[PDB]
């Protein structure tokens, strides 16, 4: 029975992103009240950039650690680090402790994410099944990104401040108990063969093309998410609720597209799927700045989310397959890069987005992103199978 592994990885990614996104609506209000006692200040943006930066920095080291000692011990250490960090963030009272708690969450997130993706790729050796389960495990990323803020707002309204974090800590306890029940991280078990170090993989043009497609496709929405409400409040003078309701199509369509195209990308071809995904996200971002109301922004956001789901869900199994085909088949070191792409999107996203939007404007930012996506799109023709 290898469905328990899939369940553990789905739950790990879910709770990771639930925490990452539940922190977001709360801490501005708490920081403002503590100060009394733009959308991003000099300090506020750091609390969202640090989780992604520390994870980006510590992905490559986990890449080699999993080869040295195996997957279960990193996964369990990720559980423990995330649990302790969540309680610390629940009870923390000062800003520096917010910083160190966010950094510990980032370290634990890197541990669990990289080791779990490697373990999935290691248990599901078949190509088609690998894709079908990568789809479902990725659906949990976008299912935490979607249900985080609602959960946070409801629990922070009814019970109190510490309630969402204590509930998430209880969920992490249950996940760790399931891990001890199935994984049993008892001993240190070295892997069989060598690992083809990162300096050898990073010279491969096809791995570079795949990672760059993931990076740009995700950087699109990474720079679209923060700067859309600012431009909306100026151009339409919309009410507080239309800001939140405007972005639901992107998240809903991301979830649906991930879960469907996991299974559906092996029938059309993963290179064709990535090519059409790049074209569609480019056209949608180019079409955004022409809207008038939210009725104008309903369809382009659906296009963006659907296309990003296509790209990611068809470009992860291809990383696994490229390693299987051209190098030694161990997956921690290549999913290190695959996750560095995601984190690179989410780290410098809001800062550079806001800077460029202030410098030249919102339509120019959107046009630049769209043209870059459309121009990278033809490179995904080199990933087609020789037969």
UniProtKB/Swiss-Prot annotation:
Record annotation: effect of changing residue 28 to A: Abolishes dopamine uptake
Effect of residue 130 to A: Abolishes dopamine uptake. Abolishes serotonin uptake
Effect of residue 247 to A: Abolishes binding to dihydrotetrabenazine. Reduces binding to reserpine. Abolishes dopamine uptake
Lipid bilayer topology: Multi-pass membrane protein
Activity regulation as described: Strongly inhibited by reserpine and tetrabenazine. Also inhibited to a lesser extent by ketanserin and fenfluramine. Reserpine and ketanserin inhibit by blocking the substrate-binding pocket. Tetrabenazine traps SLC18A2/VMAT2 in an occluded conformation and its inhibition is specific to SLC18A2/VMAT2 but not SLC18A1/VMAT1.
High-level lineage: Eukaryota, Metazoa, Chordata, Craniata, Vertebrata
Binding sites annotated in the UniProt record for serotonin: 141, 145, 218, 221, 225, 247, 254, 312, 346
Protein name per its UniProtKB record: Synaptic vesicular amine transporter
């Amino acid at each position: 029975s290898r469905k328990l592994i899939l369940f553990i990885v789905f739950l790990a990614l879910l709770l990771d992103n639930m925490l990452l996104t539940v922190v977001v609506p709360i801490i501005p209000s708490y920081l403002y009240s503590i100060k009394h006692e733009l959308n991003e200040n000099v300090q506020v943006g750091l609390l969202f950039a640090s989780k992604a930066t520390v994870q980006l920095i510590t992905n490559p080291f986990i890449g080699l650690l999993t080869n040295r000692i195996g997957y279960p011990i990193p996964i369990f250490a990720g559980f423990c680090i995330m649990f302790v960090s969540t309680i610390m963030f629940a009870f923390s009272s000062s800003y520096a402790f917010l910083l160190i708690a966010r950094s510990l969450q980032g370290i634990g997130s890197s541990c669990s994410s990289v080791a779990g993706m490697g373990m999935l790729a290691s248990v599901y050796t078949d190509d088609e099944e690998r894709g079908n389960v990568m789809g479902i495990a990725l659906g949990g990323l976008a299912m935490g990104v979607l249900v985080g803020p609602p959960f946070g707002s409801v629990l922070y309204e009814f019970v109190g401040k510490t309630a969402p974090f204590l509930v998430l800590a209880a969920l992490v306890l249950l996940d760790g108990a399931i891990q001890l029940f199935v994984l049993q991280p008892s001993r240190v078990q070295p892997e069989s063969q060598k690992g083809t170090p990162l300096t050898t993989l990073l010279k491969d043009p096809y791995i570079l093309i795949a990672a760059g497609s993931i990076c740009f496709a995700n950087m699109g929405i990474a720079m679209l998410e923060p700067a859309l409400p600012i431009w909306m409040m100026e151009t339409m003078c919309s009410r507080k609720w239309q800001l939140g309701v405007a972005f639901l199509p992107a998240s809903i369509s991301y979830l649906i597209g991930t879960n469907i195209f996991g299974i559906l990308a092996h029938k059309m071809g993963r290179w064709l799927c990535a090519l059409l995904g790049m074209i569609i996200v480019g056209v949608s971002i180019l079409c955004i700045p022409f809207a008038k109301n939210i009725y104008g922004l309903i369809a382009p956001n659906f296009g963006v989310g659907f296309a990003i789901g296509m790209v990611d869900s068809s470009m992860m199994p291809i990383m696994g397959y490229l390693v299987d085909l051209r190098h030694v088949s161990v997956y921690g070191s290549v999913y290190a890069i695959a996750d560095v792409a995601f984190c690179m999107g989410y780290a410098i996203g809001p800062s550079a987005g806001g800077a460029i939007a202030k410098a030249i404007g919102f339509p120019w930012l959107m046009t630049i992103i769209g043209i870059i996506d459309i121009l990278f799109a033809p490179l995904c023709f080199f990933l087609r199978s020789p037969p």
